[PDB]
Amino acid sequence: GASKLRAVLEKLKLSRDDISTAAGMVKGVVDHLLLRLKCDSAFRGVGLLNTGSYYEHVKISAPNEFDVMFKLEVPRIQLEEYSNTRAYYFVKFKRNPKENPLSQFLEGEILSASKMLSKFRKIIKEEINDIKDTDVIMKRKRGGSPAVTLLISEKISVDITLALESKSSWPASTQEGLRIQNWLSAKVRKQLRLKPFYLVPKEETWRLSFSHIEKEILNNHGKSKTCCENKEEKCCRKDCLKLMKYLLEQLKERFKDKKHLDKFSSYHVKTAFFHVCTQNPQDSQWDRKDLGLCFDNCVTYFLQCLRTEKLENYFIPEFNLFSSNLIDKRSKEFLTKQIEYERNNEFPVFDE
Numbered sequence: 001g002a003s004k005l006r007a008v009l010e011k012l013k014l015s016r017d018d019i020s021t022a023a024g025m026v027k028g029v030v031d032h033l034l035l036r037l038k039c040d041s042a043f044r045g046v047g048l049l050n051t052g053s054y055y056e057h058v059k060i061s062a063p064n065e066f067d068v069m070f071k072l073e074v075p076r077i078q079l080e081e082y083s084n085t086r087a088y089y090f091v092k093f094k095r096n097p098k099e100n101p102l103s104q105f106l107e108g109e110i111l112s113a114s115k116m117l118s119k120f121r122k123i124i125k126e127e128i129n130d131i132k133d134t135d136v137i138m139k140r141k142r143g144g145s146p147a148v149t150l151l152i153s154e155k156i157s158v159d160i161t162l163a164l165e166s167k168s169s170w171p172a173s174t175q176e177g178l179r180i181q182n183w184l185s186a187k188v189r190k191q192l193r194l195k196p197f198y199l200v201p202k203e204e205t206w207r208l209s210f211s212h213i214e215k216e217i218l219n220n221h222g223k224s225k226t227c228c229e230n231k232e233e234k235c236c237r238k239d240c241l242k243l244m245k246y247l248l249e250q251l252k253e254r255f256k257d258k259k260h261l262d263k264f265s266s267y268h269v270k271t272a273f274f275h276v277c278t279q280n281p282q283d284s285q286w287d288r289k290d291l292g293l294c295f296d297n298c299v300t301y302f303l304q305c306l307r308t309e310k311l312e313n314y315f316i317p318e319f320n321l322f323s324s325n326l327i328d329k330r331s332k333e334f335l336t337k338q339i340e341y342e343r344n345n346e347f348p349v350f351d352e
């Protein structure tokens with residue numbers, strides 16, 4: 001069955017790597033925003049999350065939809081967990097200078113996201129009109145984040161998310177997360193947990209974000225340090241993740257008229273994939289020749305998650321992305337059946 005999956009992956013590789021002026025239109029827009037933000041008092045320390053993440057694609061079937069993250073370092077940050085949610089936090093300050101750069105967004109001890117987002121939108125709003133280069137128009141749809149969405153000409157779309165960066169130890173609710181010890185090693189888990197973490201808005205609560213960790217794992221993904229560095233140990237982890245992402249997008253596109261799959265997104269698929277990486281830590285369990293079987297492990301596991309309504313966040317295991325209060329039974333049963341139909345029909349959404 002690996003023949004059809006290879007073709008899907010090769011078509012997908014060709015649209016990725018095909019010459020496109022898109023990422024260059026995005027970089028120029030972003031560079032201007034960053035310069036204008038930087039000469040403002042609240043945003044002096046603003047920058048891009050990854051330098052080279054102008055062409056950062058969440059949607060693997062839409063090469064004109066980009067997603068970028070602007071970060072702002074918050075020293076001496078004081079976090080308070082909201083309502084035992086494990087993942088949502090009030091942000092207050094230890095306060096070294098009474099007025100650090102973010103003072104103008106406080107309400108009491110607590111940092112206001114809505115007010116910080118409003119000034120961020122407005123500054124960006126005042127630089128879009130200033131643009132003489134290309135056709136740029138922004139759209140404000142609710143949710144909190146992705147905060148600002150810019151449309152460059154007819155096809156190019158960019159989501160801009162503002163995130164706070166903290167360089168201190170990850171919050172206690174991550175303690176039992178990142179369960180990579182038996183796969184990538186305990187040492188690697190330590191090195192990654194020494195990296196910063198982020199907070200995005202989503203009640204003026206912020207949500208922990210570990211965006212930046214996926215690139216770190218995906219580029220160094222084997223139990224063997226030489227995974228995918230020769231022909232004797234080529235594995236299919238990356239391809240399985242891409243095929244899972246493309247499955248959800250195609251299903252979401254096929255059923256955009258109904259509402260049942262609106263709660264699901266690629267991070268649900270990413271999460272479930274990395275849980276299978278923990279379950280199956282050996283490179284031999286990810287042999288390239290076994291693409292078809294391995295993809296089926298991933299599908300099977302994700303379907304198990306839907307039916308039991310349990311999908312643990314990868315960093316904060318007590319958080320169930322599939323709880324009833326987050327996604328109702330109807331939605332999960334609808335997705336379960338659509339995937340079964342794909343699985344038992346040699347995945348028709350791939351040849352279309």
Ligand SMILES: Cn1ccc(-c2ccc(Cl)c(CNc3nc4[nH]c(CCc5ccccc5)cc(=O)n4n3)c2)n1
Binds near residue numbers: 316319
């Ligand atoms: C986009 N959204 C909206 C809401 C949340 C959310 C909800 C609850 C929690 Cl408890 C958290 C905690 N924060 C969080 N959880 C993730 N999960 C992954 C996917 C898995 C992964 C990623 C990289 C390496 C290995 C596995 C990507 C990511 O950036 N985060 N960030 C995040 N997320």
Ligand SMILES: [Zn+2]
Binds near residue numbers: 222236237
């Ligand atoms: Zn590999």
